Design an enzyme around this catalytic site. Structure first.
Site, PDB file in Angstrom:
ATOM      1  N   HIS A  41      36.828 -20.736  27.123  1.00  0.00           N
ATOM      2  CA  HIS A  41      38.170 -20.496  26.606  1.00  0.00           C
ATOM      3  C   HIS A  41      38.752 -19.162  27.062  1.00  0.00           C
ATOM      4  O   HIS A  41      39.808 -18.760  26.561  1.00  0.00           O
ATOM      5  CB  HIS A  41      38.182 -20.592  25.075  1.00  0.00           C
ATOM      6  N   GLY A 143      36.946  -9.118  21.511  1.00  0.00           N
ATOM      7  CA  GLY A 143      36.345  -8.638  22.739  1.00  0.00           C
ATOM      8  C   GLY A 143      34.842  -8.783  22.800  1.00  0.00           C
ATOM      9  O   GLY A 143      34.240  -8.388  23.806  1.00  0.00           O
ATOM     10  N   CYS A 145      33.239 -11.835  22.337  1.00  0.00           N
ATOM     11  CA  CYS A 145      32.875 -13.142  22.865  1.00  0.00           C
ATOM     12  C   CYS A 145      32.248 -12.992  24.244  1.00  0.00           C
ATOM     13  O   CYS A 145      32.716 -12.210  25.077  1.00  0.00           O
ATOM     14  CB  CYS A 145      34.102 -14.049  22.930  1.00  0.00           C
TER      15      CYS A 145
HETATM   16  C1  LIG Z   1      36.559 -14.186  21.633  1.00  0.00           C
HETATM   17  O1  LIG Z   1      36.776 -15.129  22.677  1.00  0.00           O
HETATM   18  C2  LIG Z   1      36.960 -12.803  22.075  1.00  0.00           C
HETATM   19  O2  LIG Z   1      36.215 -11.843  21.854  1.00  0.00           O
HETATM   20  N1  LIG Z   1      38.135 -12.696  22.701  1.00  0.00           N
HETATM   21  C3  LIG Z   1      38.625 -11.429  23.175  1.00  0.00           C
HETATM   22  C4  LIG Z   1      39.966 -11.401  23.817  1.00  0.00           C
HETATM   23  C5  LIG Z   1      39.780 -10.825  22.459  1.00  0.00           C
HETATM   24  C6  LIG Z   1      37.347 -14.594  20.374  1.00  0.00           C
HETATM   25  C7  LIG Z   1      36.929 -13.755  19.164  1.00  0.00           C
HETATM   26  C8  LIG Z   1      37.734 -14.049  17.919  1.00  0.00           C
HETATM   27  C9  LIG Z   1      37.162 -13.389  16.688  1.00  0.00           C
HETATM   28  C10 LIG Z   1      37.034 -11.889  16.792  1.00  0.00           C
HETATM   29  N2  LIG Z   1      37.186 -16.025  20.073  1.00  0.00           N
HETATM   30  C11 LIG Z   1      38.228 -16.852  19.988  1.00  0.00           C
HETATM   31  O3  LIG Z   1      39.375 -16.526  20.289  1.00  0.00           O
HETATM   32  C12 LIG Z   1      37.926 -18.250  19.458  1.00  0.00           C
HETATM   33  C13 LIG Z   1      38.418 -19.299  20.439  1.00  0.00           C
HETATM   34  C14 LIG Z   1      39.646 -19.951  19.834  1.00  0.00           C
HETATM   35  C15 LIG Z   1      39.830 -19.418  18.427  1.00  0.00           C
HETATM   36  N3  LIG Z   1      38.686 -18.516  18.236  1.00  0.00           N
HETATM   37  C16 LIG Z   1      38.330 -17.940  17.078  1.00  0.00           C
HETATM   38  O4  LIG Z   1      37.349 -17.204  17.015  1.00  0.00           O
HETATM   39  C17 LIG Z   1      39.174 -18.266  15.847  1.00  0.00           C
HETATM   40  N4  LIG Z   1      38.370 -19.043  14.919  1.00  0.00           N
HETATM   41  C18 LIG Z   1      38.583 -20.368  14.760  1.00  0.00           C
HETATM   42  O5  LIG Z   1      39.564 -20.933  15.276  1.00  0.00           O
HETATM   43  N5  LIG Z   1      37.657 -21.012  14.016  1.00  0.00           N
HETATM   44  C19 LIG Z   1      37.665 -22.446  13.665  1.00  0.00           C
HETATM   45  C20 LIG Z   1      38.978 -22.777  12.915  1.00  0.00           C
HETATM   46  S1  LIG Z   1      39.302 -21.939  11.380  1.00  0.00           S
HETATM   47  O6  LIG Z   1      38.966 -20.553  11.522  1.00  0.00           O
HETATM   48  O7  LIG Z   1      38.729 -22.697  10.308  1.00  0.00           O
HETATM   49  C21 LIG Z   1      41.082 -22.005  11.129  1.00  0.00           C
HETATM   50  C22 LIG Z   1      41.481 -23.445  10.821  1.00  0.00           C
HETATM   51  C23 LIG Z   1      41.770 -21.548  12.410  1.00  0.00           C
HETATM   52  C24 LIG Z   1      41.467 -21.098   9.969  1.00  0.00           C
HETATM   53  C25 LIG Z   1      37.581 -23.308  14.936  1.00  0.00           C
HETATM   54  C26 LIG Z   1      36.247 -23.173  15.653  1.00  0.00           C
HETATM   55  C27 LIG Z   1      35.100 -23.522  14.727  1.00  0.00           C
HETATM   56  C28 LIG Z   1      35.131 -22.642  13.495  1.00  0.00           C
HETATM   57  C29 LIG Z   1      36.461 -22.773  12.766  1.00  0.00           C
HETATM   58  C30 LIG Z   1      39.826 -17.033  15.197  1.00  0.00           C
HETATM   59  C31 LIG Z   1      40.568 -16.215  16.258  1.00  0.00           C
HETATM   60  C32 LIG Z   1      40.837 -17.478  14.136  1.00  0.00           C
HETATM   61  C33 LIG Z   1      38.782 -16.138  14.525  1.00  0.00           C
HETATM   62  C34 LIG Z   1      38.423 -20.777  20.123  1.00  0.00           C
HETATM   63  C35 LIG Z   1      38.488 -21.748  21.282  1.00  0.00           C
HETATM   64  C36 LIG Z   1      37.538 -21.273  19.000  1.00  0.00           C
END
Ligand SMILES: *[C@](O)(C(=O)NC1CC1)[C@H](CCCC)NC(=O)[C@@H]1[C@@H]2[C@H](CN1C(=O)[C@@H](NC(=O)NC1(CS(=O)(=O)C(C)(C)C)CCCCC1)C(C)(C)C)C2(C)C
Ligand SMILES: *[C@](O)(C(=O)NC1CC1)[C@H](CCCC)NC(=O)[C@@H]1[C@@H]2[C@H](CN1C(=O)[C@@H](NC(=O)NC1(CS(=O)(=O)C(C)(C)C)CCCCC1)C(C)(C)C)C2(C)C
Lengths: 301, 301
Positions: A41, A143, A145
């Site tokens: 992603h 950051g 991930c």
């Molecule tokens: C990571 O890739 C990173 O370090 N990125 C750098 C550029 C900044 C990043 C870290 C985020 C937390 C610190 N990861 C993501 O962006 C992932 C990818 C997109 C969304 N997230 C992600 O962590 C989500 N979490 C999320 O969507 N979790 C769920 C859904 S949920 O939280 O229940 C809700 C419905 C959205 C409330 C989907 C995945 C399984 C667990 C639940 C957040 C950014 C919201 C923390 C990917 C593809 C999952």
């Protein structure tokens, strides 16, 4: 003596952590031989995250859209491919610090060390456990991930985890180094429930043996139990069932202390039914379940 | 997000850990440039430990009595000397993995990472704090003496601790890298009392800010206090006094959460007087005091 949550030395892994920037997103990658592994992603915009077609998104990407960086060294991507949820970026330079390594998929209840990194630079090291519901309780900011979990077996680095996402609970989820997610989770930003989490019973008993080895014995009672009768108490408090395999695994700890596993289970039965009554065990007022029997034996021999 | 006890990456330090064997004793040494640093009681027999004259004992030692080993490499000792409590063994080979380093003597209340080693081989990594009574709560078995504590400042390894001894309490004591012991302790096997230990108050507040940053807010009350009135409660529960310097240090944490330091102290006052009433803070049923304000800011930015 003394007992502390301990992580493996991270030197072999630090020399493999690189920075991966795709368009507007920057995260971490794992540089083994001539491939950089990272969560797929990284190619997604904040809009793509909601419903991504990774095959269509990756097709619009060329090699020059991936800026990989190892400190000051800049690594050429001469190709890109997808292994289920991880992006494999082939580079023109083999990592000279590549250690002897394997890719393993660990079991729920097992532990590993996480080398947390940000923008390709290692930040810290800490020990984590794969919960029964296939999540982990770590420390992952924006950051982080791409940071990996690993064990060091004899003279081999066993990579077992790569961080992808955060749960609404505050717990984390990721994949193995082949791109397969631990748990029912998918890399899409949509509602996904983690399973009811349970306590790793064999880990609690190993932690109670560590307390006995380090002098804490106030919880030992002079009663014993059966595997059936204990598992009735275990499911009441959402403790995962104890098997004969779990008893055999604790053999080295029961032999060192002279306290049979079924004897310790009667002490754990009392602790669950009556609490700790204001006392502590190894400096904790709660029961700890993130130490495997191997972790305890490792810290006592 | 998430908050975990985190230790610095140990790669720069692993390449400096060697094995030091003098007669019948085997422990760890630190190989910087062309000197190996190790606790001076490596020259002592179990009988010498009770009342050692280190000057007389070292005189009977020649260079060939010290077997230094870095993995398979065998380092020639071309001289030996004593810096207050550490033995400096000059070798004929400069360590090619010597990092940029300094020798610092840390303050009580500050934290550092320990690279636990046994027979010159790194075993694990964990974070420790220099208690107000100049002890530490670590994990040190037989063969761990010589393991060092360190911080990583910008691009510099700041060595601050070398392990020597265990206390009757189960806590540990050692020296800086110049051989000066932290605390009133001497390297002699005789009765020595550690001071009454107190709780690092500024660390507890930094840990409470970390809980607020990570969503745990149930302990926040809508009262505030003064520095005097709080320090009256602090000394009752053996909490070390809060100064205006401590308030200024917590500035970055109070600014991020919008909760003044004196406001948080009223919450800590309630927690000490009423306990936690069965709840937890960041997954702990006890107040944690081994996170500096820097440690919390490090894990949140
Ligand atoms: C990571 O890739 C990173 O370090 N990125 C750098 C550029 C900044 C990043 C870290 C985020 C937390 C610190 N990861 C993501 O962006 C992932 C990818 C997109 C969304 N997230 C992600 O962590 C989500 N979490 C999320 O969507 N979790 C769920 C859904 S949920 O939280 O229940 C809700 C419905 C959205 C409330 C989907 C995945 C399984 C667990 C639940 C957040 C950014 C919201 C923390 C990917 C593809 C999952
Ligand atoms: C360390 O050198 C090591 O790893 N050695 C390798 C070869 C096996 C070793 C580690 C011991 C604990 C695992 N350290 C020592 O041998 C030091 C040196 C001798 C005694 N100890 C030591 O740790 C003592 N502790 C000790 O004597 N502590 C006190 C005295 S006491 O414990 O109160 C008592 C009166 C003896 C009961 C003296 C020092 C200050 C604190 C109190 C034990 C082996 C008993 C743990 C040196 C010179 C201190």
């Amino acid at each position: 003596s003394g007992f502390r949550k301990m992580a493996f030395p991270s030197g072999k892994v630090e020399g493999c952590m690189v920075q991966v920037t795709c368009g507007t997103t920057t995260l971490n990658g794992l540089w083994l031989d001539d491939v950089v592994y990272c969560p797929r992603h990284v190619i997604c915009t904040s809009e793509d995250m909601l419903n991504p077609n990774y095959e269509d998104l990756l097709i619009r990407k060329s090699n020059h859209n991936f800026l990989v960086q190892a400190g000051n060294v800049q690594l050429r991507v001469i190709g890109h491919s997808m292994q289920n949820c991880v992006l494999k970026l082939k580079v023109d330079t083999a990592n000279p610090k590549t250690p002897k390594y394997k890719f393993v998929r660990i079991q729920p209840g097992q532990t590993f060390s996480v080398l947390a990194c940000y923008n390709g630079s290692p930040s810290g090291v800490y020990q984590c456990a794969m919960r029964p519901n296939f999540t982990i309780k770590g420390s992952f900011l924006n950051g982080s991930c791409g940071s990996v979990g690993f064990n060091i077996d004899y003279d081999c680095v066993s990579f077992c985890y790569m961080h992808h996402m955060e749960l609404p609970t505050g717990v984390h989820a990721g994949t193995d180094l082949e791109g397969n997610f631990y748990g029912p989770f998918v890399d899409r930003q949509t509602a996904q429930a983690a399973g009811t989490d349970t306590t790793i019973t064999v880990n609690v008993l190993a932690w109670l043996y560590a307390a006995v080895i380090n002098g804490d014995r106030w919880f030992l009672n002079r009663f014993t139990t059966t595997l059936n009768d204990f598992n009735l108490v275990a499911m009441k408090y959402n403790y995962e069932p104890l098997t004969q395999d779990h008893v055999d695994i604790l053999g080295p700890l029961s032999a060192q202390t002279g306290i049979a596993v079924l004897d310790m289970c009667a002490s754990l039965k009392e602790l669950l039914q009556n609490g700790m009554n204001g006392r502590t065990i190894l400096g904790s007022a709660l029961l700890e379940d993130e130490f495997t029997p191997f972790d305890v034996v490792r810290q006592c021999s």
